Amino acid sequence: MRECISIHVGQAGVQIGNACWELYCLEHGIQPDGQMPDSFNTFFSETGAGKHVPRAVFVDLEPTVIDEVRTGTYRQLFHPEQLITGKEDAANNYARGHYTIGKEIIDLVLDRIRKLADQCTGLQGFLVFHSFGGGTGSGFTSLLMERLSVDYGKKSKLEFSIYPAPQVSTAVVEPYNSILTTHTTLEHSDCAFMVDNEAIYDICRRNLDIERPTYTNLNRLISQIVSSITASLRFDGALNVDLTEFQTNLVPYPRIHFPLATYAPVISAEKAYHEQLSVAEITNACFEPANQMVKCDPRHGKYMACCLLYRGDVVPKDVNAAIATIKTKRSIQFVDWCPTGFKVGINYQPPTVVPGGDLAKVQRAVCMLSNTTAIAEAWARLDHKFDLMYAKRAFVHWYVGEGMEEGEFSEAREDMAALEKDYEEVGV
Amino acid sequence: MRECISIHVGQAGVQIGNACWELYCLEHGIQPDGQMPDSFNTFFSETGAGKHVPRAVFVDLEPTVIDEVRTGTYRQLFHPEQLITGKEDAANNYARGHYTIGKEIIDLVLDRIRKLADQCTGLQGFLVFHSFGGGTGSGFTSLLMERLSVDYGKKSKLEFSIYPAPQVSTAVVEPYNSILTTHTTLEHSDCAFMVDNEAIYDICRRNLDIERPTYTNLNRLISQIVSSITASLRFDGALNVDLTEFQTNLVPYPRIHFPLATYAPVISAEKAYHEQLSVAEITNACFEPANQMVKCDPRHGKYMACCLLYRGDVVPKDVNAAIATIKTKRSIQFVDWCPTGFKVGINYQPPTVVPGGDLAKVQRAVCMLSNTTAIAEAWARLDHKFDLMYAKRAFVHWYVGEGMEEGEFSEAREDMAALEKDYEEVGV
Amino acid sequence: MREIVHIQAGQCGNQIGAKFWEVISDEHGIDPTGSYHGDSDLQLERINVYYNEAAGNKYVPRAILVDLEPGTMDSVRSGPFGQIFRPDNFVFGQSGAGNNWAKGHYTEGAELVDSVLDVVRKESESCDCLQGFQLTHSLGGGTGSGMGTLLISKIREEYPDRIMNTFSVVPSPKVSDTVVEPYNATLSVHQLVENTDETYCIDNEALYDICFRTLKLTTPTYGDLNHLVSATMSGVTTCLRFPGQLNADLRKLAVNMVPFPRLHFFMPGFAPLTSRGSQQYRALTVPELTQQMFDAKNMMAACDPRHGRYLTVAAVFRGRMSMKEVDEQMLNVQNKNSSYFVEWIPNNVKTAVCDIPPRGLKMSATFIGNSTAIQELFKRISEQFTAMFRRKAFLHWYTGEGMDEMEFTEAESNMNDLVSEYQQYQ
Amino acid sequence: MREIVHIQAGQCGNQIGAKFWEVISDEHGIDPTGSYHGDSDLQLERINVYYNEAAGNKYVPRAILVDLEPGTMDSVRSGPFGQIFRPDNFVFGQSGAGNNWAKGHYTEGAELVDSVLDVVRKESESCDCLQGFQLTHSLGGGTGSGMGTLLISKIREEYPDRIMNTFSVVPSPKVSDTVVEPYNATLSVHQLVENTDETYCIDNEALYDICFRTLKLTTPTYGDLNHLVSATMSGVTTCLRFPGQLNADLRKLAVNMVPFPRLHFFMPGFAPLTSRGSQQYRALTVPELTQQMFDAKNMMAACDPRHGRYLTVAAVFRGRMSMKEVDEQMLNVQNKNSSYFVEWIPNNVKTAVCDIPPRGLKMSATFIGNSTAIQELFKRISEQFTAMFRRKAFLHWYTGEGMDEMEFTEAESNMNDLVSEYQQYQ
């Protein structure tokens, strides 16, 4: 009836998608072959007899990562034409992604998206998974975003983004890419849910007792959050919230569209047994900074909108009580222009857990989407990083080679300065 | 009751006929010996007891290609006297086909045709299969066409033509031949269905995932279209369209008689499983340029008449809906003098598939016959090609040797210029 | 005592016709062999209106089947009820008309028409007192349109004092099934305005809508569409075939509903129509029926009756009913929707009641509306035709068959005149 | 003789509505299939007030279900009693409103509203004498609030002389379930003050409190909360559906309780309410009921009635009771708590008694208070709205849907005016 299209861009996007789709399959009892021996229809189309196909598009500019999907366990799950690969990667270069390499494959991907949309009766919108730092995740994604807005426009667009960490980082040009994609995507995205790999690592180590978390673990964790977000569409609940809701409830001004995700409880079977995981207790967990999925200081910021999505054996009254308690707590401060800061979703289905996963089976969970002036701090460091490198024109030539102009960088800088100013001003 | 005579001229014609007849046999359960252990009677005559003979004539000016038919799997299927061969070929020379070599065998073939017609109670007309580029396919065919008109006249004549591609081509003199046959056949043909080998190759590669398509594959693909066209005569359907219909519904002015064929869906067993091949989806496929069987740009032209022949598990309402949707789509434009641009046929029999073929078994198919001002572009390039070569009188002497006069070339040029002018003027 | 002669022309005509015949057989308790296996004596009392008794207690439709192609005939003969028809009443050509009115009317049809006329004459001469003729066909093809039209005229010449009825499936607004549809339709209309006493305007689009929205039919078939038409036809002749409290036959209806000779194009409707699921959640009362009747969603012509005014409405009710209720409700509707009824014909509604309901139901209704909104349909065709003629498109296909341009112009003129007339009364 | 038309808008509206319907069915002895399996003839005598008889001794709610999303509808249809509803009375969109009043009222809702209006019109026209309309919805969302409000206005235009009743679940003081709640509520209120005859102010917070403190419910469910609301609704219409000693219907209550047109926001209450344990340790007498009624802990609005004054109170009693006792007790309470009753309306209490008690109980009571303390609620919303507007927060979500700032200002003005009016009388 009402359907959701998932787009997975670049390595990070693709890998996250792999997790998410697996989780979905597990949850709806769909086998890796597409067979199952009816709300799942929002995510899976049905073909002929006893086969189900994800409403998904996977894109990468190199073949290697998607080649694993097409040779792996879930090779039969996806339709070949929805797994799109080029030949040469974007090489951590926004320009290659947005112009030189991306312009060769974008039309094809758009056609696929259009075809997907033709099979929808009540398209809710798009979920796009991508990194900010990679050349395809940035450059290609911005290109795709802009295109989507023209073709569709009014339909809601949601981004899941691996935000770069303060200390830990892989790429050298990552700041440049992050700024540039932010500039170009800002006017085209309705809401973007950031997460941070550092934070997820720490949580894994501290809360799950995992010595050595791998990217797979992180992906799995991400998948849970995604499931929480989309459970309101994929199941029936007491009080529920669709994809069109979030943008209205979490974005007070058009440019300030960066809410952050937090999941609770994330605990092993060791510490699960020795704990009464009540609604109040889980809720409280979410408002303490060590459990949050972006490295950043909320204690140094103020909350503007908070959305709480509960799942499983949960009753309204206790949730309400918990919210009241949170409100009472002086150390959790909300901006003065927002007396009503909570949006609450409650769904009946407990979180399903992947066999051989790190997480224990729980009666209840919560996914909080929170919008905070603390994001300004994060932006600032990134800006500073950008500024240093540009002061020496370090790496700038590469970008120019691929058709980008120096003036674009300046523009991007300016826009980020504006954004940070806006963030500051909302606070006061 | 109502019968159809097939004529297969030259190599290309003969090979296409081989495919088509095989397909027919498969569809009606006729063995390669003519036996079957009653609508098929429109295509097969019945002799004595438990034998069926195609209402077909095969003609070539050299023995080699037909010698394969007379020694092959279906040697017993055809009556020896309906497989007609000369000794020397037309050597890619229209003049040899039309005059020098053709005038030796034409009378014989006409007699055979007359004999075939004597066994018909309600002759609908003729289907002629031939290339534009070969000396026999051109020169002989034009001769035969003219003759047919005199002997019969009022009966409908339909051509299936391998139109030469823009880039890819085999013969060097191909443009000369194409122009000349067009000139001479124009006033004698009621409707001619063009196809292009380049386009079929691309479709095979792109849609069927075939690395290396052979002529056989192309022939098989062509056969399907032919079956679609004639299924209305060979089976009983919901809403059906005979051979006499097309000429009325697709030809708005006598000279503008070149509609183009498109088939859908053409897909392997890989991509068949992971797709709900609905009526709307197949119909939509037909109006996108990459799936069409002539290399040419409809987006740069306008549609004048469109005929859609559906086959298999298809219901009127959905077809109607699809047509409405197509009409709504701004990128598919029809000329302003034609508010009703659709002719629709619906037949109950799903497409039958040849064992060991490239195509998957489908519940539904569609064959579109579309008439478009985009054919003008195709004509133009050909004209240009002709013009260059004639500027130097390149190859002209050969034609002269076989009795052709230079003035004939001029006349042909003039007629093509007229045709292109007409095409342009219809558009405005 | 009174007799009806049935004619079926072309593909559409034959296919609807077969369904109609089946329906009639069911109603009168006659099986596919021609033998009566009914129960009620009312079923047989007026069986002679549609059936000739061919001895050995067997009944045969007074039906003539005509086509320029034999395929349709073959399909019919092989169908369920194909065996009830008289073999000599199938009159088929060999050529076909190729969706060309000219061929149907002047060429192929001309060759075959004499035979059909002869058959018709024979049929008439056996029957004691012919009320008249009902022809089923399309206007958009070549056979039903060109040959059917020709047949009408010839019939009229012989039998100028008998009633001439047509059930014509007309070109829809949204989607066209032929390219030359406007030409074929227009020419047919030209002949129809002058030579028929009434024409029931059936539109496939409307039928589809009904199937989808009212009948809740995921995948309607052409057969299903035809069924509705058949039902309507049955409703229209019910007073000739069964008793009643107030009876109206074809002539009575015509006189009530046609105030000026040219204005005889009806929008038919049928009620009730419910899904399998929604059968439980409504009561079978007259009010519901009335509501269904007076509703744009239930009209079998692709025209909104609220875009014009009703000149006359004939309502034909079947089942055991209170006449008072009917009278009240017809009054009430008129009072309510005064603006949709022409003000200079007081009491715009004619009512008839037949005691015998159709099988499986307790109560049914058939609606015939003569609405000035039908002009819209005519206008749309007319515009299209004019456009086509502006570029002389496809004209050589018709002129090649001996037709002259002048005829086309004449047809156009008539069409325009009709719409003007409709407008004037509106 | 008299008829009520029920409308349900949005998630909350639908969910309460279903419960209400279930309750009604139980009361009248109708099962989930639509068939009557009751015993007392009193149960069926006035069944037509809420149910249409759809033949085959089956009954169907005069209920219209509206939402911009189909999920809720699906949930309802699949529920226990989902099958009693008329399938054609479910009117759903595909998009949703995303907790945006603008979408509900001007955009998505606008597209869908016509259909719902048509359905309503049809319902009205079948019913002989409509008393009026009851709408269940929230003010805090987009559908129930924006589309529901739109529906009200449209209904009023058609039927200006019929009674317009709403059961509105309003934003609580402690915790908000949406961020834009104050906007949605405010706009809804603006329309409600001008277009409804009465509004029952239900607060979820109050319900929760009741469940916890009075019902002793460790884990209340939204269903349980809804049940209370349903019961209240049932209590409110009891005199239309059963006999009594002194009878008051919707109009009588309205005239008694609304002294000035704008002051029609009631605090409803229901009595008795006891735990499983505390059932034994109290006697079922009128005094106890009275006590329960006149108590802040038993009010379904999050407002302390002792912080204002009662303009009017309507008490509706069910069961076999001594009228004298009732009269005495109502007098006595007034005497006792003179300070909480406005001094310029002598005899502030209206009493009605219905002989038929609800099932499982011997005796019940429903309270409707028109208290000037409701102003507090309005004030709290108003302040919030003003604050939000000061920073233009979230405004682009509404202006993007075509709304202008001026409308917001107007709404604010109305809100303030209402509170001023309330204060004046206090």
Ligand SMILES: Nc1nc2c(ncn2[C@@H]2O[C@H](COP(=O)(O)OP(=O)(O)OP(=O)(O)O)[C@@H](O)[C@H]2O)c(=O)[nH]1
């Ligand atoms: N959470 C998570 N992050 C990832 C994963 N893979 C890569 N990343 C992060 O993504 C960023 C690197 O971007 P990639 O996605 O590898 O690059 P890409 O999108 O393929 O872009 P190019 O290869 O430059 O075309 C770094 O911040 C990585 O830490 C993954 O599986 N999970």
Ligand SMILES: Nc1nc2c(ncn2[C@@H]2O[C@H](COP(=O)(O)OP(=O)(O)OP(=O)(O)O)[C@@H](O)[C@H]2O)c(=O)[nH]1
């Ligand atoms: N589709 C298809 N095209 C063919 C086939 N054989 C030849 N052609 C095309 O036909 C054209 C060459 O003409 P032919 O039919 O071989 O020549 P011909 O008709 O025998 O004439 P002559 O040999 O000159 O007497 C070229 O455009 C070929 O690509 C075939 O089996 N299938």
Ligand SMILES: Nc1nc2c(ncn2[C@@H]2O[C@H](COP(=O)(O)OP(=O)(O)O)[C@@H](O)[C@H]2O)c(=O)[nH]1
């Ligand atoms: N209602 C109905 N319409 C049909 C049927 N078959 C064809 N038509 C319509 O008839 C028109 C085509 O004309 P047709 O009668 O086939 O051509 P003809 O044989 O030359 O008269 C189109 O408008 C079709 O939609 C049918 O079985 N039922």
Ligand SMILES: Nc1nc2c(ncn2[C@@H]2O[C@H](COP(=O)(O)OP(=O)(O)O)[C@@H](O)[C@H]2O)c(=O)[nH]1
């Ligand atoms: N009493 C009650 N309130 C509800 C229920 N469901 C949602 N609500 C309330 O309705 C408000 C949310 O509005 P909702 O009706 O879901 O949004 P809409 O669908 O856009 O109108 C919140 O104040 C919820 O507390 C329910 O089942 N019962």
Ligand SMILES: [Mg+2]
């Ligand atoms: Mg990569």
Ligand SMILES: [Mg+2]
């Ligand atoms: Mg050759």
